[PDB]
């Protein structure tokens, strides 16, 4: 798909949740850091 | 390919600021951890800098275009991306194949401020069938990977949701 006319991206505005974003061109993102991790079982 | 991965030392300020973004942006999810697992924090195993000359110049070229359409404002963010295709992304970059066709906000490439949001997509949409080894969306053993990405938003369409 394309951005809404006159826009370069979409902001998905979220009580505790932060925003999600959508770009329609892959050149508008660079993968700076690769993070290797495990999720931790709570205490 | 052109891509090299540079290991950051845990002692490096860059390692510590990326870890802090990863740890501080965990939240509880409305699925009670169905997609991404049950956790309040991560065991960070490694942070690598992704270095690809071509892909960087591809990024900075598009950033200048957006910037010049937006009173010299790229509106650049650092955001999380989870995908089974992280290996293809670091080598070939983001493209049509990395789009979320069924996405709430349209068929494009999705990024999250919440690391725990991107974590839901590492094994696919809704966490798919979980880790390839144990078939467990809440696996505490298997090594997961997230991208921390420089994203040009430019003029962003504000969509209110739920
Ligand atoms: C509303 C939705 O939000 C998101 C937020 C983050 C991500 C992500 O990090 N990776 C991938 S891969 C396919 C979809 C997504 C995704 C979708
Ligand atoms: Zn596993």
Curated annotation (Swiss-Prot), chain B:
PARP catalytic domain ranges (all copies): 9-162
Tissues in which the UniProt entry reports expression: Highly expressed in placenta, skeletal muscle, liver, brain, kidney, heart, thymus, spinal cord, lung, peripheral blood leukocytes, pancreas, lymph nodes, spleen, prostate, testis, ovary, small intestine, colon, mammary gland, breast and breast carcinoma, and in common-type meningioma. Highly expressed in fetal liver, heart and brain.
Compartments reported by the entry: Cytoplasm; Golgi apparatus membrane; Nucleus; Chromosome, Telomere
Post-translational modification: Ubiquitinated at 'Lys-48' and 'Lys-63' by RNF146 when auto-poly-ADP-ribosylated; this leads to degradation. Deubiquitinated by USP25; leading to stabilization. ADP-ribosylated (-auto). Poly-ADP-ribosylated protein is recognized by RNF146, followed by ubiquitination.
Protein's job: Poly-ADP-ribosyltransferase involved in various processes such as Wnt signaling pathway, telomere length and vesicle trafficking. Acts as an activator of the Wnt signaling pathway by mediating poly-ADP-ribosylation of AXIN1 and AXIN2, 2 key components of the beta-catenin destruction complex: poly-ADP-ribosylated target proteins are recognized by RNF146, which mediates their ubiquitination and subsequent degradation. Also mediates poly-ADP-ribosylation of BLZF1 and CASC3, followed by recruitment of RNF146 and subsequent ubiquitination.
Subunit: Oligomerizes and associates with TNKS. Interacts with the cytoplasmic domain of LNPEP/Otase in SLC2A4/GLUT4-vesicles. Binds to the N-terminus of Grb14 and TRF1 with its ankyrin repeat region. Interacts with HIF1AN. Interacts with RNF146; this interaction leads to ubiquitination and proteasomal degradation. Interacts with NUMA1.
Recorded family membership: Belongs to the ARTD/PARP family.
The protein, known as: Poly [ADP-ribose] polymerase tankyrase-2
Gene that produces this protein: TNKS2
Stretch of the intact protein here: 951 to 1112 of 1166
């Amino acid at each position: 798909a394309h951005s809404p006319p006159g826009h370069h991206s979409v902001t998905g505005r979220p009580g505790l949740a932060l925003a999600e974003y959508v770009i329609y061109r892959g050149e508008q993102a660079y993968p700076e850091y690769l993070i290797t991790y495990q999720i931790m079982r709570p205490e | 390919s052109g891509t090299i991965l540079i290991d950051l030392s845990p002692d490096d300020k860059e390692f510590q600021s990326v870890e802090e973004e990863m740890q501080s942006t965990v939240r509880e999810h409305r699925d009670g951890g169905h997609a991404g697992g049950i956790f309040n924090r991560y065991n960070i195993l490694k942070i690598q800098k992704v270095c690809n000359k071509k892909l960087w110049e591809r990024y900075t070229h598009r950033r200048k275009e957006v910037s010049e359409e937006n009173h010299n404002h790229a509106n650049e963010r650092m955001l999380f991306h989870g995908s089974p295709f992280v290996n293809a992304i670091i080598h070939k970059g983001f493209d049509e194949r990395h789009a979320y066709i069924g996405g709430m906000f349209g068929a494009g490439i999705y990024f999250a401020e919440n690391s725990s949001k991107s974590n839901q997509y590492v094994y696919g949409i809704g966490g798919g069938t979980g880790c390839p080894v144990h078939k467990d969306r809440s696996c505490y053993i298997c090594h997961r990977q997230l991208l921390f990405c420089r994203v040009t938003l430019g003029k962003s369409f504000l969509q209110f949701s739920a």
